[PDB]
Design a protein around this nucleic acid. Structure first.
Ligand SMILES: [Mg+2]
Ligand SMILES: [Mg+2]
Ligand SMILES: [Mg+2]
Ligand SMILES: [Mg+2]
Ligand SMILES: [Mg+2]
Ligand SMILES: [Mg+2]
Ligand SMILES: [Mg+2]
Ligand SMILES: [Mg+2]
Ligand SMILES: [Mg+2]
Ligand SMILES: [Mg+2]
Ligand SMILES: [Mg+2]
Ligand SMILES: [Mg+2]
Ligand SMILES: [Mg+2]
Ligand SMILES: [Mg+2]
Ligand SMILES: [Mg+2]
Ligand SMILES: [Zn+2]
Lengths: 220, 131, 99, 83, 70, 216, 129
RNA sequence: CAUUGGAGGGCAAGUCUGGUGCCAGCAGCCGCGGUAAUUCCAGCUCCAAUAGCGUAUAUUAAAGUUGCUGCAGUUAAAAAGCU
RNA sequence: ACGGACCAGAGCGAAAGCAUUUGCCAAGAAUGUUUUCAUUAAUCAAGAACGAAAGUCGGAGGUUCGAAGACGAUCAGAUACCGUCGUAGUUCCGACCAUAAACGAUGCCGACCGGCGAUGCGGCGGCGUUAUUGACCCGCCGGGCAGCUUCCGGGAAACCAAAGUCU
RNA sequence: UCCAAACUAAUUU
């Protein structure tokens, strides 16, 4: 019973966009959860990272709402992270899955050395930065595993990063800035320009452009 | 303390847009109209809605009202909108320019263009406000 | 924390400015810190100007002025309501109040 | 980009800003990709062809995307040389 | 900042050796004053003689009587 | 645009630009608008180079013809000197006009009523229309702007150096733009003038209206 | 004062890179900089650079391709043996796949992959990636 | 005939039952106990590592809390009054 | 004794600090320069000069003000606030003393990195006004004190064009 | 610009 309300949501439902790669090429702002449910559905696994209570002092006692940290992502290079504060536990956990789905980013995997098989670790030394926390991701060799704190390990496993050495800094006792600084790190593995990507970009035309005809008789 | 709430002001504006042809400047006439075209639950509300329509009828009669589209007024400010005089305002055939305006036209390669009578530039350089 | 970018005074390229005394309570205030108020209040109080001018021995006699430059400390200028407290973004505003 | 066998092991190759040669990221939502129409050399009507330029958002937040597209179109000769 | 030059090892080694004294765990393990002050004398255990049974009151909010020996 | 003699300026159009006063700029100058300026006068007024503003205006026209659905181009003027020209622009070219107050979230708040997702923005003034320029940086949306000497060119992607302050010079630059859209599409021809008479687009003052109703 | 000319050269190239500029002035030209830029240019991170002679320590205009992430110098020029070179590799370079440590060996100013081939150590100048 | 420690949280494992009622006690740390104790004393269960396992003390990592790699020094500890 | 108004987010000084007129003495920055020398430099344990106020020791002087002191009030008390007197001190000359929220709570030298409008000094250029080389006007260059503005970047943030160029 | 000081050891959210 999902009716899309966006121009991008119409082309997804009408079987015109075949993967998220056609969206991530053009940096199109995802504003609907079902677009992620359409492609990556029945492959995503969720996990609640922490339910922390926050309090607002009022003139009649305290106004406690509940804040929810939800990790999402299939184990093959996509990770979201959603934060939502609500008055109820189940209300917060539901809505923070949506915000986690609207932040699915691709994770570029790379090789430590001797590029044999499938890419298994981070391509180079990246570093996230959130709050006082900076989380560095160092490329490990093959059977190393993820040598890290238990909070970003749940984020790095859900990217299909098999191998990483992790350095941390700052107050990692707050989980919010320590989950985001991890999420800021793996979301710039594509933002970094290696020598592999110096070949000039051929320009494919935009999905709002290569369906102007299918779009105008249906979405209008 | 006679301030009218939003449920009276919102209902009165939708009546006039739908039924401007029936309304006048009599309260008691529009009192009978407002019960004819509307399911108003109470009589004391009915006098307030009719009392604010008749107040608006004077403002509509003098000029336009912010939020109310009158088809007599909307379609006849279109003559203000769709207006073209018999001569354009641009075809002047003698255009007062500066020597710097003329000297750019030479670098624009239109120095052989017609007159565009130059004016003497002001010798003051008094163009800034005192601070 | 720091509340104003200058420190409530106009001392930038020097080390020490000479002090003056508050005209309301004689507190030593640096000269750039003090709330300066130049008043050109008339000496006549225009409720009384139509009595002084009808009683003059002249006909066209412009009444004189009174030129007092007042100084204030921050304590007295607030208490006299010469100045007021402002919002955090409204402190960053140096245009004087209009006339 | 590829393992030593030659298989392209990637999800996608990202675009590069055609004025700064840096990666247009996944969530760089200020990054545009505009098209400049091509006209024929005789009548000046739209023939169906176009040039594609992409400007990343940081160059766009800098306020230099104006001169950037202006320089990228003087290389194709779309803008006149005597600008 | 810090000196980085290639012959500054003495400046770096001596500044370090002076600034080691400004934390607690180095200071008490190298003065010998605290080693002089604990009654074990650098040992883990000691045998003694009970002189007296003493009652020690607990610090608040706790409100018990802690049974100790002198 | 392109050193094609069919796309050149055709001096008929120069007398329009001098009669409206499009070559006149402000007394102060933005550093990024420096390349479009010819020379400052004696009264502080900068002179806009008309060769520069002809190339960008034709560059701006190529960006609109590259849009397939004509209503994907959205045109905004919040300042009243230009609200008439925007409506009559989209009446010809088929664009999507937003006259008056631009409500925020029009491009970002996907649940409300007026939520349209364009592919191109054309505005009148970067300082006055800063709000949709700011929101166009959230949705990958390139913007064309009419710009003066003192305009901040932040999210402007094609700037047309003009006089967007006078009423006669706002409407002319919208008129010259609409004419070059329909010529490049081939809808109207360029062997004969166009039947619109460019003072159709000019903003007329409310006291200027009623003073000629007895004259006309 | 200015103690190190190579450091002020590489800091100015690094600042103009992230500002997105195309060209950059490098004030005083030494021959160590020129030999440093060619190693950056043979591996293709910078364009052609023009050297300007003004009858003192000249100036260099450098074309920037937009490929450089970080050109850094190492102070002091620590002597590096071939035994210790791989420990500098995983402290300076972001990956084992790209990036170079520039050495000055007796056979000239070299990147670190060439010095393994030639089997020689040297003092470290800087790095770029 | 398998012990040694635990079961509020850190931290794997019970809102079980009985006693005690800021007492006796526990508790490295935050804490628990003043009459319905998820923490005491016991029974039942359960957990952990196992012929081993607690506890005290020196010490190393954790500690980018001594910082060569690698710390800070506007307001958190801190740039000498100035040359 | 003190130098008001003029007197400023203006100047000068290493900082402390510096304001009536005129004369004398020595200093100095910045600018100008197709002069000269040719690395003479940068930062600095030890050492050295300077260092408000209060205080100390000698002389001189003491108008104002005023610790201490004495009263008058207020007060439950009031050896405080407020008032009335008033020592040392405040003033100068010659020695000491070496500390201040001695603060931009921000070492110094150097490089690079956004705009914009002003300001002070020096130089240069430019329509015209005005006086018998100055005064205004429009810019340019360099050092300076600052401001506004910015998603440069940074930061725990407040905020900083430096506290930026730092995993 | 008159005065205006103090606040269970008796605990359980
Ligand atoms: Mg001082
Ligand atoms: Mg436990
Ligand atoms: Mg240790
Ligand atoms: Mg370590
Ligand atoms: Mg520390
Ligand atoms: Mg402190
Ligand atoms: Mg200091
Ligand atoms: Mg005077
Ligand atoms: Mg010393
Ligand atoms: Mg003294
Ligand atoms: Mg004496
Ligand atoms: Mg008294
Ligand atoms: Mg004294
Ligand atoms: Mg001190
Ligand atoms: Mg700092
Ligand atoms: Zn006072």
């Amino acid at each position: 019973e999902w009716m899309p309300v966006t121009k991008l949501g119409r082309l997804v439902k009408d079987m015109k966009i075949k993967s998220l790669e056609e969206i991530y090429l053009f940096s199109l702002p995802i504003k609907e959860s079902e677009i992620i449910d359409f492609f990556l559905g029945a492959s995503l696994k969720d996990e609640v990272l922490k339910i922390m209570p926050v309090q607002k002092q009022t003139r009649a006692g305290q106004r406690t709402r509940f804040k929810a940290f939800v990790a999402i992502g299939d184990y093959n290079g996509h990770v979201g992270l959603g934060v939502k504060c609500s008055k109820e536990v189940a209300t917060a956990i539901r809505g923070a899955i949506i915000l986690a789905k609207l932040s699915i980013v691709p994770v570029r995997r790379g090789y430590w050395g001797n590029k044999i098989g499938k890419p298994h670790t981070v391509p180079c030394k990246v570093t996230g930065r959130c709050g006082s926390v900076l989380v560095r991701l160092i490329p490990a060799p093959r059977g190393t595993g993820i040598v890290s704190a238990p909070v970003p390990k749940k984020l790095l496993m859900m990217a299909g990063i098999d191998d990483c050495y992790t350095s941390a800094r700052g107050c990692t006792a707050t989980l919010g800035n320590f989950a985001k600084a991890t999420f800021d790190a793996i979301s710039k593995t594509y933002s970094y320009l290696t020598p592999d990507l110096w070949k000039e970009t051929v320009f494919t035309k935009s999905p709002y452009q290569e369906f102007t005809d299918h779009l105008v008789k249906t979405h209008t | 303390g006679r301030v009218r709430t939003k449920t009276v002001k919102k209902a009165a504006r939708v009546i006039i847009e739908k039924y401007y042809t029936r309304l006048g400047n009599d309260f008691h006439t529009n009192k009978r109209v407002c019960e004819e075209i509307a399911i108003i639950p109470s009589k004391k509300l009915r006098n307030k809605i009719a009392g604010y329509v008749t107040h608006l009828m004077k403002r509509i009669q003098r000029g336009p009202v912010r939020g109310i589209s009158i088809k007599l007024q909307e379609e006849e400010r279109e003559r203000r909108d769709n207006y073209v005089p018999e001569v354009s305002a641009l075809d002047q055939e003698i255009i007062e320019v500066d020597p710097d305006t003329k000297e750019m036209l030479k670098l624009l390669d239109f120095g052989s263009l017609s007159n565009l009578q130059v004016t003497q530039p002001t010798v003051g350089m008094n163009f800034k406000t005192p601070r | 924390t720091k509340k104003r970018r200058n420190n409530g005074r106009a001392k930038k390229g020097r080390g020490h400015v000479q002090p003056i005394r508050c005209t309301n309570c004689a507190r030593c205030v640096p000269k750039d810190k003090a709330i300066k108020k130049f008043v050109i209040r008339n000496i006549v109080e225009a409720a009384a100007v139509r009595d002084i001018s009808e009683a003059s021995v002249f006909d066209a006699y412009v009444l004189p002025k009174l030129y007092v430059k007042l100084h204030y400390c921050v304590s007295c200028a607030i208490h006299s309501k010469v100045v007021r407290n402002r919002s955090r973004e409204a402190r960053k505003d140096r245009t004087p109040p209009p006339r | 980009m590829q393992n030593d066998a030659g298989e392209f092991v990637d999800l996608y190759v990202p675009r590069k800003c055609s004025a700064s040669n840096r990666i247009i990221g996944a969530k760089d939502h200020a990054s545009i990709q505009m098209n400049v129409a091509e006209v024929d050399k005789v009548t000046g009507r739209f023939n169906g062809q176009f040039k594609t330029y992409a400007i990343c958002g940081a160059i766009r937040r800098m306020g230099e995307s104006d001169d950037s597209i202006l320089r990228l179109a003087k290389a194709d000769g779309i803008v006149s040389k005597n600008f | 900042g810090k000196c980085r030059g290639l012959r500054t090892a003495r400046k770096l080694r001596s500044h370090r050796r002076d600034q080691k004294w400004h934390d607690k765990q180095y200071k008490k393990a190298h003065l010998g004053t605290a080693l002089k002050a604990n009654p074990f004398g650098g040992a883990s255990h000691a045998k003694g003689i009970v002189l007296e049974k003493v009652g020690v009151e607990a610090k608040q909010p706790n409100s018990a009587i802690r049974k100790c020996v002198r | 645009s392109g050193a094609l003699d069919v796309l050149q300026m055709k001096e008929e159009d120069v007398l329009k630009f001098l009669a409206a006063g499009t070559h006149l700029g402000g007394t102060n100058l933005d550093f990024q608008m420096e390349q479009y300026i010819y020379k400052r006068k004696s009264d502080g007024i900068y002179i806009i180079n008309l060769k520069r503003t002809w190339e960008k205006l034709l560059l701006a026209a190529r960006a609109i013809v590259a849009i397939e659905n004509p209503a994907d181009v959205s045109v905004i003027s919040s300042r009243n000197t230009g609200q008439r020209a925007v409506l009559k622009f989209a009446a010809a070219t088929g664009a999507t006009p937003i006259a008056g107050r631009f409500t925020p979230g029009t491009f970002t708040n996907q649940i409300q009523a007026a939520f349209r997702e364009p592919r191109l923005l054309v505005v009148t003034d970067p300082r006055a229309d800063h709000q949709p320029l700011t929101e166009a940086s959230y949705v990958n949306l390139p913007t064309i702007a009419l710009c003066n000497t003192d305009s901040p060119l932040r999210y402007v992607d094609i700037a047309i150096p003009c006089n967007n302050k006078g009423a006669h010079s706002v409407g002319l630059m919208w008129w010259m733009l609409a004419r070059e859209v329909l010529r490049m599409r081939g809808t109207i021809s360029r062997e004969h003038p166009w039947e619109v008479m460019p003072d159709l687009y000019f903003y007329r003052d409310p006291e200027e209206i009623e003073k000629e109703e007895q004259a006309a | 004062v200015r103690m190190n000319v190579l450091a002020d050269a590489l800091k100015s190239i690094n600042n103009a890179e992230k500002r997105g500029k195309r060209q950059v002035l490098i004030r005083p030209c030494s021959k160590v900089i020129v030999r440093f830029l060619t190693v950056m240019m043979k591996h293709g991170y910078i364009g052609e650079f023009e050297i300007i002679d003004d009858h003192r320590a000249g100036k260099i205009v450098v074309n920037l391709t937009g490929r450089l992430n970080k050109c850094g110098v190492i102070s002091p020029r620590f002597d590096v043996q071939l035994k210790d070179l791989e420990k500098w590799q995983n402290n300076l370079l972001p990956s084992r796949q790209f990036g170079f440590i520039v050495l000055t060996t007796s056979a000239g100013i070299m990147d670190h992959e060439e010095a393994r081939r030639k089997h020689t150590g040297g003092k470290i100048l800087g790095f770029f990636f």
